[PDB]
Curated annotation (Swiss-Prot), chains A, B:
<feature type="domain" description="Guanylate kinase-like">
    <location>
        <begin position="3"/>
        <end position="181"/>
    </location>
</feature>
<dbReference type="GO" id="GO:0005829">
    <property type="term" value="C:cytosol"/>
</dbReference>
<keyword id="KW-0808">Transferase</keyword>
<comment type="similarity">
    <text>Belongs to the guanylate kinase family.</text>
</comment>
<keyword id="KW-0418">Kinase</keyword>
<feature type="binding site">
    <location>
        <begin position="10"/>
        <end position="17"/>
    </location>
    <ligand>
        <name>ATP</name>
    </ligand>
</feature>
<dbReference type="InterPro" id="IPR008144">
    <property type="entry name" value="Guanylate_kin-like_dom"/>
</dbReference>
<dbReference type="InterPro" id="IPR020590">
    <property type="entry name" value="Guanylate_kinase_CS"/>
</dbReference>
<dbReference type="GO" id="GO:0004385">
    <property type="term" value="F:guanylate kinase activity"/>
</dbReference>
<keyword id="KW-0547">Nucleotide-binding</keyword>
<keyword id="KW-0963">Cytoplasm</keyword>
<dbReference type="InterPro" id="IPR027417">
    <property type="entry name" value="P-loop_NTPase"/>
</dbReference>
<dbReference type="GO" id="GO:0005524">
    <property type="term" value="F:ATP binding"/>
</dbReference>
<comment type="function">
    <text>Essential for recycling GMP and indirectly, cGMP.</text>
</comment>
<protein>
    <recommendedName>
        <fullName>Guanylate kinase</fullName>
        <ecNumber>2.7.4.8</ecNumber>
    </recommendedName>
</protein>
<dbReference type="InterPro" id="IPR017665">
    <property type="entry name" value="Guanylate_kinase"/>
</dbReference>
<dbReference type="Pfam" id="PF00625">
    <property type="entry name" value="Guanylate_kin"/>
</dbReference>
Length: 201, 201
């Protein structure tokens, strides 16, 4: 009952989306924020599952309205975290996972100090290229551009609280579980959850 | 290869010693500091296993010599953490567990800032009395005195980073594992352990 935000960032092709989806299956009382994006809906994508897919007009509206807790521009497209959904989850006592880039992370850290951030590292640059190329949904020409953006994303790893290497899926998931589980044992969180016990003693 | 100190504190009778012993069996690269004490050696106690049992003359000597990283007086007896052994472990890249009281914790926090501290709570005051009474090695008259010292120890829980309830042994051990495991995934620790990978990228 002292819910927190858990920021997860990684270069494209690091396997972050899959890790986060397994994480929420393994843990209770934690949900993934579904972002809004102007990035074109790809074959395979599902509205309300991968993203809320909208156009620039809609997204710009939300920005001016202040509907986003956080928003950024990435590869000439827009992504943002709808503010109200997140706050409803926190109110309900559920932790929230934010799969956002380094720019969004900076915003969240300012706005919600207790937030913890985790950076997912690939075991090699070649691992990124491999995973990205195998996504037939993606253009195989923007690769050299996406990999360039990946190295720049990774240069920001120093801004994060934890680093986790995705070299073995199960182990990486287990490490994410350690990090969230430990947060939930912090004195600040426990003062609330153990209110009755601490009262007795 | 960025080893840390993990302080474990709890009122007498909370089952801390047993938890810590199971913890070191479950994790690698972590060792328990064996303290020096003037507290009389009890039936069942083993030299170099439970404590290094010495007399006041020896202990006072160590204090004046500065042989202790940390030392305190508890129930009119002396306990301390020999400094050199701990530093050797850290140098070797091994984390160190310190089973010390709240006074010792304050000293360690000053002396070694990265240190994390965990307070073990009993599920009830009656749990302490039960566990203590069942220790036939202990005098059953000092109980009301030890329980008084337990409530005063527990009032210091606010000085600790994490709170863990020992209501189920396996679960409490698993929570200790989360806490140490998460520390080892911190960016500061990972900058060292992942030096080669970060170099490649
Ligand atoms: N700041 C921010 N970044 C996001 C958000 N959603 C996705 N991203 C970032 O945008 C990148 C592009 O994701 P993609 O277009 O590959 O699905 C992600 O890897 C992530 O770093 C968001 O809501 N806010
Ligand atoms: N400060 C400090 N406290 C210790 C040390 N060793 C044991 N203690 C504290 O002294 C208490 C008494 O332990 P006992 O006499 O029951 O074995 C422990 O519960 C612990 O809080 C030590 O090396 N330093």
């Amino acid at each position: 009952n002292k819910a927190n935000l858990f920021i997860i960032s990684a270069p494209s092709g690091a396997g972050k989306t899959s890790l986060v989806r397994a994480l929420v299956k393994a843990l209770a009382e934690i949900k993934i924020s579904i972002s809004h994006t102007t990035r074109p809906k790809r074959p395979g994508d599902q509205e309300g599952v991968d993203y809320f897919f909208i156009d620039e007009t809609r997204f710009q509206a939300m920005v001016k309205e202040g509907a986003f807790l956080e928003h950024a521009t990435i590869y000439e497209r827009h992504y943002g975290t709808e503010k109200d959904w997140v706050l409803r989850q926190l109110k309900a006592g559920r932790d929230v996972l934010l799969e956002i880039d380094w720019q969004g992370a900076r915003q969240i850290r300012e706005l919600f100090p207790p937030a913890l951030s985790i950076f997912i590292l690939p075991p090699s640059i070649e691992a990124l290229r491999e995973r990205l190329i195998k996504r037939r949904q993606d253009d195989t020409a923007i690769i050299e551009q996406r990999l360039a953006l990946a190295r720049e994303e990774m240069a920001h790893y120093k801004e994060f609280d934890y680093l986790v290497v995705n070299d073995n899926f199960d182990q990486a998931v287990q490490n994410l579980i350690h990090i969230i589980s430990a947060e939930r044992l912090q004195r600040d969180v426990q003062e609330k959850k153990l209110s009755r016990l601490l009262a007795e003693l």
